Amino acid sequence: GPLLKLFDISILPKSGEPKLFLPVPSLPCQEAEKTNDKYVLAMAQRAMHDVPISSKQLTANLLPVKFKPLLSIVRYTPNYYYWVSMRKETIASANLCTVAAFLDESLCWGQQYLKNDFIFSENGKDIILDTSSALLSQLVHKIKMLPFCHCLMQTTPQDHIVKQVCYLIASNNRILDAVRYLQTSVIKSPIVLLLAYAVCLPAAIICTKNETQLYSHCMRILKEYRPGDVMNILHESLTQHLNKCPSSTCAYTTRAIVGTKANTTGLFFLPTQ
Amino acid sequence: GPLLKLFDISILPKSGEPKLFLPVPSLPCQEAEKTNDKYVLAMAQRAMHDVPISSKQLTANLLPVKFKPLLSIVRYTPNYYYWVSMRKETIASANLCTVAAFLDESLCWGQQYLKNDFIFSENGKDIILDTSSALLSQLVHKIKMLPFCHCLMQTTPQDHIVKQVCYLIASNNRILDAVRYLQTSVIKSPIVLLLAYAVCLPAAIICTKNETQLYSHCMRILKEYRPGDVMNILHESLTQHLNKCPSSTCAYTTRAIVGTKANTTGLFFLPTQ
RNA sequence: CAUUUU
Ligand SMILES: [Zn+2]
Ligand SMILES: [Zn+2]
Secondary structure: OOOOOOEEEOOOOOOOOOOOOOOOOOOOOOOOOOOOOHHHHHHHHOOOOOOOHHEEEEEHHHHHHHHHHHOOOOOOOOOHHHHHHHHHHHHHOHHHHHHHHHHHHHHHHHHHHHHOOOOOOOOOOOOOOOHHHHHHOOOOHHHHHHOOHHHHOOOOOOOOHHHHHHHHHHOOHHHHHHHHHOOOOOEEEEEEEHHHHHHHHHHHOOOOOHHHHHHHHHHHHHHHOOOOOHHHHHHHHHHHHHHHHHOOHHHHHHHHOOOOOOOOOOOOOEOOO | OOOOOOHHHOOOOOOOOOOOOOOOOOOOOOOOOOOOOOOHHHHHHOOOOOOOOOEEEOOOOOOHHHHHHHHHHOOOOHHHHHHHHHHHHHHHHHHHHHHHHHHHHHHHHHHHHHHHOOOOOOOOOOOOOHHHHHHHHHHHHHHHHHHOOHOOOOOOOHHHHHHHHHHHHHOOOOOHHHHHHHOOEEEOOOEEEEEEEEHHHHHHHOOOHHHHHHHHHHHHHHOOOOHHHHHHHHHHHHHHHHHHOOOHHHHHHHHHHHHHOOOOOOOOOOEHH
16 A cells, blocks of 8 residues: 655754754863963964874974873863863864874873873873774774775785774774784784774773773783884885785775875874884 | 783884875876866866855755756766765765765755666766765764764654664665665654665665665655755754753764864755755 | 674
């Protein structure tokens, strides 16, 4: 007979006059930051804007002296939700250049936690660490968009690992299950190593006292990292790929995922050797 | 003995220069578009730039007269991979403002196919329809990131349908399985309706004659759409949420996912009533 | 859907 109705007519909008913009919920004004340190205040003023990323370079062996000054904002700002929201906006709309920059920043920051005997916890109010889960999800989304030849044209592709780690995160954000799975094999692909680097901080933050062994594995990964590894791994893999992939279309699919340049809104620094 | 080695050291790149960019090849110069229609040529020149979206508004009463002239570029351009890669770059880095604009464009374009008895094909070389799957995946990514009060604070949330459709697309791009699931129920939430609108053209493109029932359902959805509905549905939902949700954290997180303005790079027109 | 993929 007649078909089943498609939808209830009551859910359609009350007005059919054209809307050119979505609502912007303007939010309260920011309080003054709680520091008089003019280097730290300058770093925050530049983090608020999309500065060319070369201007934000910070040599990693100078980061130790800057860590405690920068904590006055990164850990103790009165504008916590404003800063986290700013950074999540950039990450949720990030190309792979932007993802890579934020990953290197977060991992160098995490290594300073270790150097200073800080513990990792989700109640720690840290505007860099508290966007690391959003960043892991974004990295997985970029890897799933790349043509499959990027994973298959590595010396030891470990494609089954890439596929299962991406499924666990994309399907239901199963962060600790992804660590459990990564523990079962030696890592032999640089793409798998990027995923391990990206999972270690958001997993460590959510471990309870019943998951001390998983926490310990996350700290092994964090300690092996060296400043700049995420940018260095991707720069090398993408160059080799252009020199060997025979597809007539891969380069165009890939350029759109990688992007033209990074967006540094919310990024305090790009750490390098 | 020691624990299992973390990774084979050979996968790390040689330390060399500090990396401040990621490599992509440079684009060749453009060929001339195959038309002398000044109106079409002007629309394509604007499409190349992130100009304010009010300057790209098109009343959908005019789209039927412009459809055939515009095919000279959308369907027969000698610059196919330039246009599709430009549009996929914008969509893969898109906030929800941008996703909504491109969805309305694609749905109105698909309606002109239907009105003219054109068929939908994976190899049809259409720079608008060939980005509709990327757009579906990005809409699902945005819905997953919104605080869940957005889906639950609806008259009839159908929260189980939203979650399962999002699972099917995000886990394995199971587009036809998502249509099959949607066809079982009357749609009673605006969020579910947005997902139905976003799925109908990517599904129509990959249906064969062995999926004639699912194809018919996709054509039912496409015919019921009214130009501008994606922006109008999202504007009403976000306006009424802002009035009713009491969470301060929700406002900050929502602003991050929605964004403050659309990126129109690669967008030809924003269709409206 | 009831942890759905491998
Ligand atoms: Zn390739
Ligand atoms: Zn809310």
